[PDB]
């Protein structure tokens, strides 16, 4: 019962359906790729980018990790961002959270003495949490969970915008836009939490934290 | 223009159908997930695992990084592995490489002096190449590329097998299998490179590196 | 010339003396170590902990990195912390910053777009600065630098306190203290910035961030 | 007894002795540093660089970690190397192992199912180990341990030489030399395992592995 035959038969059928309808569906992407989109999202099994957006092969380059986290000192995620931006010249970066996310739950409730690598990994969710005690405390377990997801989404858009890669791209006039969205596993629909950000002006109007003070910090000293 | 209306409209259209076909498609995965698979794959825009295996929401938990790499020392990949194995209790790990992989070509032709984070990330790929330098010795460019891909899939499978998370599940008598697969962007077809590995003895029959030696080295001293 | 003879000659001279003073200086630490201290400090060439505390061989176990930084997600620092606490059974952790620290100045004046790995590594330093933006607001260059150093020492001490290794030793009733110190390259003098922390209650009295909140957040939901 | 008074009194006395003998000992390094040496070595409490070499403040910038490891995807160690080479323009890099090293022991004998971050961290020692089964198997526990230390030293010189930083420096004609040495805790003496390496020619003559094939790999393809 460790056998893959059923699973290989599903893939075979799918590939045949696809090319029967469009002969160059796969052929036209045999030898290179040029997607317009990068998507950064959760490793959760209910949130499948290509299928929920209906995008075909060669349309969306994807990073996927527990909690949809972005950090300058994570060479895994930073690699997806640098390769898309600097070598494929993508136009749009999608940063996506989901309701009912258990990486955000563990962030609310786990004691940091918890054994294992997952507890190390979701340290980033604790940091967003600890900054928003005023939006979180004394809500129902349910209302706190949905609000944790939204805040993290906002946290990770800022991280993408404040990243060295995306900062160098905007400095050399490359058009690049960043987007904060959220998915509902219960209904399969996407909602837009934050409108499009295409540079320092949009960022300055749409994000809670101050990206400009972040980038130019000694223009606030003496 | 970075307008999202077109993408959202495609998600609308997508959700309505899936539901009209089947009323409970989404609502039954409202409040939890219990997938049976973990997929570790490449970040490239042509290899979409839920799409290419035709899997419904909540069927396959996903890690996706430049080059489908697995190291004990990468907390991003290691948490995907710990969460599925230890808490979700999955049964099958899919380790997937792909033909035409730009990460594997970078591993053959870049000089380690190249700037930027992607050059750091693919060091694992240079190490597989060096240990196997002789196998890649007189091949045409295309032939070294296809070989690199396949050698990388075998290594990554040994890495999952040798990981502390996995050695631990085996010693506890957890049922958990590991499978080396490859994908062709040009055809949409999955091929199987290494048959199922369900414990230490399959790993002895199937892998070219010695998993027993790695696990029990110190016994071969006096 | 890269000849090593001069350096080796200085080690010869050094060893002979220490031994002539005291026959068993070296031979008694031939086959094990049991130090009582762990030092986490900066990599800068002026801050040499065994020298500046005048400690003999086997007295102080050392971590040294650009900016004396501590994150749950850095396996280099975290193993120094786990090995001493869990296996060597140490009693005191020294977390040491220094005046004139180029890492702390880089954290104030670099634009996150700057190339190279040192710019990634010091993100922890930008985050301490941002949370405390107001305290650093109208200071002269020298004054913001000295403040940055001191704020960084407090943060890093909270990081060691909040780590899973340390929370775990405390819950097991292990005696283990944590101490925030600073060093002046110009004088050779150590000053003490935060008094000893020996458990949860000292941490409540001594740190400006709330360690209890961080550990038990989820209790303040309904 | 968690009290630091005795320890602060030792530092005070030391600093006074030093400046009594030489008035500018500390003063001349109050406002910057310019060391000639970087040292990369073990966090072991018996191996204290500044004291074993008799170097004063401002002479040796130091990285220290469990096992004296160097990896392109360790931002901690890679930071020490990039800062010294590119901003301070050091001339000499010292890579140092020690006999009786317990990071190298754990590498010989631990089962990789072992819980904790230290076991993740010393994965690099397993990789050097697995490549040298022919130098290691059927030696006494003691003889295998000393040989593990020597090999690792060689492993980590190669890693320094093959690093992006040191590769870019040599390409722009910066003089920089790499040195493989070993210390004996039992006798306090240093020994030279590998003679000085100042570029690709020296590396090519003195190192077991092929640095040239490593850097220029497609000049061995067709
Ligand atoms: Zn999630
Ligand atoms: Zn690929
Ligand atoms: Zn410093
Ligand atoms: Zn050691």
Numbering used by the authors:
A (entry chain A), B (entry chain B), C (entry chain B), D (entry chain A): 6 to 227
Quote from the publication:
Carbonic anhydrases (CAs, EC 4.2.1.1) are metalloenzymes, which catalyze the reversible hydration of carbon dioxide. In order to learn more about the molecular mechanism of β-CA, we have determined the crystal structure of β-CA from Coccomyxa (Co-CA) in complex with five inhibitors: acetazolamide, thiocyanate, azide, iodide, and phosphate ions. Co-CA is a homo-tetrameric structure with one dimer present in the asymmetric unit. The catalytic zinc ion binds to the side chains of residues Cys-47, His-103, and Cys-106 in a tetrahedral geometry with the fourth ligand expected to be a water molecule in the native enzyme.
Azide and thiocyanate ions in the active site of Co-CA were clearly defined in the 2.3 Å and 2.5 Å electron density maps, respectively. For SCN- the nitrogen atom is also positioned 2.0 Å from the zinc ion, and makes a comparable, but weaker, hydrogen bond to the amide group of Gly-107 (3.4 Å). The geometry of the zinc is tetrahedral — the four substituent atoms binding to the zinc ion in Co-CA-SCN have bond angles between 100° and 120°. There is a water molecule bridging the Asp-49 Oδ2 atom and the NH atom of Gly-107 in the SCN- inhibited structure. In Co-CA, thiocyanate binds tetrahedrally to the zinc ion analogous to acetazolamide, azide and water (this work and). The orientation of the thiocyanate ion in the Mt-CA structure and in the Co-CA-SCN structure reported here is not identical. The sulphur atom in Co-CA-SCN is however directed towards Tyr-88′. For Co-CA-IOD and Co-CA-SCN, iodide and thiocyanate ions, respectively, substituted the chloride ions at the interface. The histidine side-chain has two conformations: an "in" conformation in Co-CA-SCN in which the side chain is directed towards the active site area, two conformations in Co-CA-AZM and Co-CA-PO4 (monomer B only, in monomer A it is "in"), and an "out" conformation in the structures of Co-CA-AZI, and Co-CA-IOD.
